Amino acid sequence: LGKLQDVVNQNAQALNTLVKQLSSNFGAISSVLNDILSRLDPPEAEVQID
Amino acid sequence: FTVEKGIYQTSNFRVQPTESIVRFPNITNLCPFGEVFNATRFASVYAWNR
Amino acid sequence: VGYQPYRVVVLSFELLHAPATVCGPKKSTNLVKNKCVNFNFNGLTGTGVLTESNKKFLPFQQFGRDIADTTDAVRDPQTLEILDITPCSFGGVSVITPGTNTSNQVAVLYQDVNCNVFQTRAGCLIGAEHVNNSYECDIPIGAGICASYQTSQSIIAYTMSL
Amino acid sequence: QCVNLTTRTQLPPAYTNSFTRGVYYPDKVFRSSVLHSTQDLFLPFFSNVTWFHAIHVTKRFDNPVLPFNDGVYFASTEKSNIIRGWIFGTTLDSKTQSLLIVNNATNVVIKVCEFQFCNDPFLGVYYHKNNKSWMESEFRVYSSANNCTFEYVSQPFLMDLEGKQGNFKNLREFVFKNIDGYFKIYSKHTPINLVRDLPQGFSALEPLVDLPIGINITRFQTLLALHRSYLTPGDSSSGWTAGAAAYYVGYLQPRTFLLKYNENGTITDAVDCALDPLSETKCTLKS
């Protein structure tokens, strides 16, 4: 069935892609926000958070 | 002021943990380091062991 | 005593961004399972429960990923047991209101939180009693169960009538 | 100390083809029923890999100082345990930190110092008249060393010092890598019944030891052990025997690999992306 499988597969990869978005740095020095908070003080790491 | 019949979402429920545990080893096991204290001879001050 | 050979060793420390490889911490604290706790197993700061898994890890690995690529499996370095990681906070809260000029009491519904109080299929519903009788429903809840204000009179939860 | 060899008739090196070889675990996590793609140094499939011979029946002994690229693949179909170990370094003249990975009959040591390496280090095995066993006597690998820091001793693996001329029964693979000065060793023993043209089977490689030296490596050389029986005069000039052995040396390249994981957690198949259009289609669709 093609009509009943694309509505599930496209949703499955869309939710899978959302998890993959958290693994990207978006040009910053780290992906997870807890790492840059531990390595740098919040006054200077504010631009990395934003 | 008026709320009609139906479902509504107000906030979110978060279960905050109350305890934290850290366990790096199973038991303390020091590495061999006796050569910097007990040795046949040492170095001088112009070129000291690092 | 004033001109004797003295072996001077200097033990300096460095202040820079890196995980503490050399440290003197507690070797083993108490082990707690089946509760949402926080752990630091050399690679993460994760808050979740530690269930007893049934999958055996190869004797060279430390972590464990899934299809969604999330750290949901860790190996305890104490005596080599495999513990799963599952978050304890799921979904949010919800409020059931009968409406204006009808009632004042309301019922609280939890989305995906496991527990007067009725354990429904769609989470936890509190403040509303459960009745085995089935009528037509007006306020949807989910999974074939609704809520309504019927006969004093209180808020009841029941399977909807088709 | 070391001695020099005498010129003789040798054999030119041969070139063979790899068949789904050189796949190892690139990370220390557990993966089950997933198809994860990673960027790491692997051996490309159906790549052109060098072949070196070590069989006596003639007098083949060719161990050049091959350059060390970004990761090497070393496969040996060892049967009589002729090969012993490997060395590493840049100039091998007691100026930089060289490596001695030698698997002796009693224990395995990892010594990384500035040993004075000769032009042909080797281990000599002598045959006693009274004792019907082979023991190693000529330990001619270096001359001396000045200073160094790192040292390691591995598990005492047992070696058989007897060499034969029969068919091979075991296959050993080794992968050596150096990223950020961090040494990586991957190995796995796999039995097989073949003499050449390695089978198309799949076997992932699990590491044994993980060593943080922190130096640079640009060259490497392998160590082979010969036998001194009653047939040979016993001089390392023109008369010697080496049994029957064959080892393959391959260089790793930066390639993206799609790894298949089962419910147990091991690697079953691998798909490349820069080898075949069908493989690229398989690895881009993640299926």
Ligand SMILES: *[C@@H]1O[C@H](CO)[C@@H](O)[C@H](O)[C@H]1NC(C)=O
């Ligand atoms: C860690 O130490 C405990 C207590 O001695 C022991 O039971 C356990 O097997 C050890 N784990 C290792 C060596 O991996």
Ligand SMILES: *[C@@H]1O[C@H](CO)[C@@H](O)[C@H](O)[C@H]1NC(C)=O
């Ligand atoms: C090393 O030297 C110190 C001081 O002389 C001595 O107390 C100690 O017993 C020696 N040995 C070791 C293993 O520390």
Ligand SMILES: *[C@@H]1O[C@H](CO)[C@@H](O)[C@H](O)[C@H]1NC(C)=O
């Ligand atoms: C909710 O928790 C209780 C006790 O912790 C347990 O008995 C019950 O099985 C849980 N519900 C589900 C659906 O697992």
Ligand SMILES: *[C@@H]1O[C@H](CO)[C@@H](O)[C@H](O)[C@H]1NC(C)=O
């Ligand atoms: C509804 O009736 C059934 C009939 O067997 C009974 O099992 C169930 O407990 C009743 N539910 C309530 C809430 O009384």
Ligand SMILES: *[C@@H]1O[C@H](CO)[C@@H](O)[C@H](O)[C@H]1NC(C)=O
């Ligand atoms: C490997 O290279 C040699 C010469 O460089 C060539 O003769 C041989 O055909 C090559 N093998 C393959 C499989 O391309």
Ligand SMILES: *[C@@H]1O[C@H](CO)[C@@H](O)[C@H](O)[C@H]1NC(C)=O
């Ligand atoms: C085996 O060779 C290693 C390499 O240096 C050496 O340290 C060890 O002593 C040797 N074993 C014996 C029994 O001589």
Ligand SMILES: *[C@@H]1O[C@H](CO)[C@@H](O)[C@H](O)[C@H]1NC(C)=O
């Ligand atoms: C001797 O060891 C030190 C480290 O303790 C190293 O920096 C130095 O380069 C070594 N000597 C030589 C000649 O390499």
Ligand SMILES: *[C@@H]1O[C@H](CO)[C@@H](O)[C@H](O)[C@H]1NC(C)=O
């Ligand atoms: C090792 O060699 C590389 C390339 O020749 C060089 O970039 C690096 O600085 C060297 N490291 C040391 C410690 O000599």
Ligand SMILES: *[C@@H]1O[C@H](CO)[C@@H](O)[C@H](O)[C@H]1NC(C)=O
């Ligand atoms: C992996 O799973 C299969 C399927 O049940 C089983 O036969 C096999 O024994 C498992 N292997 C291990 C190491 O548990």
